[PDB]
Amino acid sequence: LVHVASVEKGRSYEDFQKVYNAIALKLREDDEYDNYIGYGPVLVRLAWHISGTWDKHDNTGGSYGGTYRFKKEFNDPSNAGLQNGFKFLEPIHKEFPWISSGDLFSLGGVTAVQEMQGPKIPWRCGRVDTPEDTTPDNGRLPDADKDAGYVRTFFQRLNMNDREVVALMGAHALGKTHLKNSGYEGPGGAANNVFTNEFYLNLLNEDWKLEKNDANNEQWDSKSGYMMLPTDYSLIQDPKYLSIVKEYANDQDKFFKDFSKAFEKLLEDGITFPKDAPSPFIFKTLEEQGL
């Protein structure tokens, strides 16, 4: 399967910076969502789940085709709750009907991270919508109730290595688990709509307790009111993972730098970019624009 990036006709940096600003302006406006967390965390989760279907072996799935717009992927049990990120972006797609679905879903994730004061993420245009029959089947996204060997093995399919996996998981400092979506409940920290390395700090400094929640699932709970998933707590159980966790709890700039590279890589897996294709765009935030 080859997927070649095709820039939307005649579009350039300024067009996409207008779509960025639209998403970012609405993130500021619709602030009440999920008890004032706002839409940013569900939008970086949406960009990860449309990319997370990729399989390196046959180049199926991935962010290129925008296939989450089809019922099979929209109704995947693993995507429960992401309909709220879709409905947030649907106004902006009506306003810029020229951007492809893959591009709009991935740029929403980029925009949310930078607007929640994360690192800049280089983003590239050119994903092309593909037919309903190209939609990957349910079951390619990871279970939460498993251990470190499972996480390592699952992420080899998206060929991410240990460092990349641990840097990507730091995004679980954002938002929260919702019992009616996943059977897990609670936030992982106090700053859950500002991008920081707090996931790593909480994992190493809190007093975790294995408890059972109302959906009868086990999760790690702390006195402070935070929770960690079994696959999250996995990172301090494995010796290779645990020493990268310590590296990111001791250096927030290295965390930001490595997250930026692994999230772009995540969003680009499966796409062939021609050598005459434009460079990756670095978008300015509303704040750097005085907007």
Ligand X SMILES: Cc1sc[n+](C)c1C
Note the residues at the interface with ligand X (CB under 6 A): 172, 175-177, 187-188, 227-229, 232
Give the residue at shortest CB distance from ligand HEM.
Answer: 175
User: Mask 250-269, x = binds ligand HEM (CB under 6 A)?
Assistant: -------------x------
Q: Which does 44 bind (CB under 5 to 8 A by kind): ligand X, ligand HEM, none?
A: ligand HEM
Q: Which is nearer to ligand X, 40 or 187 (CB)?
A: 187
Q: Which is nearer to ligand X, 11 or 172 (CB)?
A: 172
Q: Which does 168 bind (CB under 5 to 8 A by kind): ligand HEM, ligand X, none?
A: ligand HEM
CA atoms in the 13 A half-sphere facing the CB of 125: 25
Q: Which is nearer to ligand X, 66 or 188 (CB)?
A: 188
Q: Which does 187 bind (CB under 5 to 8 A by kind): ligand X, ligand HEM, none?
A: ligand X
User: Mask 31-70, x = binds ligand HEM (CB under 6 A)?
Assistant: ----------xx-xx--x----------------------
Where in 67-86 is the site for ligand HEM (CB under 6 A)? 81
Q: Which is nearer to ligand X, 232 or 269 (CB)?
A: 232
Q: How do 3-4 and 227-228 pair as beta strands?
A: unpaired
Q: How do 227-228 and 218-222 pair as beta strands?
A: antiparallel
Residue 127's CB: how many other CB atoms inside 10 A?
29
Where in 163-182 is the site for ligand HEM (CB under 6 A)? 168-169, 171-172, 174-178, 181-182
Residues 6+ apart with CB under 8 A from 236: 203, 204, 242, 245
Q: Which does 182 bind (CB under 5 to 8 A by kind): ligand X, ligand HEM, none?
A: ligand HEM
User: Mask 139-168, x = binds ligand HEM (CB under 6 A)?
Assistant: ---x-x------x----------------x
Q: Does 231 bind ligand HEM (CB under 6 A)?
A: yes
Q: Which does 222 bind (CB under 5 to 8 A by kind): ligand X, ligand HEM, none?
A: none
Least spacing, CB of residue 17 vs ligand HEM, in Å: 23
Q: Does 119 bind ligand HEM (CB under 6 A)?
A: no
Q: Name the amino acid, one letter, at 74.
A: F
- HEC letters along the chain: CCEECCCCCCCCHHHHHHHHHHHHHHHHHCCCHHHHCCCHHHHHHHHHHHHCCCECCCCECCCCCCHHHCHHHHCCHHHCCCHHHHHHHHHHHHHCCCCCHHHHHHHHHHHHHHHCCCCCCCECCCCCCCCHHHCCCCCCCCCCCCCHHHHHHHHHCCCCCHHHHHHHHHHHHCCCECHHHHCCCECCCCCCCCCCCHHHHHHHHCCEEEEECCCCCEEEEECCCCEECHHHHHHHHCHHHHHHHHHHHCCHHHHHHHHHHHHHHHHHCCEECCCCCCCCECCCCHHHHCC
- Which residues lie near ligand HEM (CB under 6 A)? 41-42, 44-45, 48, 81, 142, 144, 151, 168-169, 171-172, 174-178, 181-182, 184, 229, 231, 263
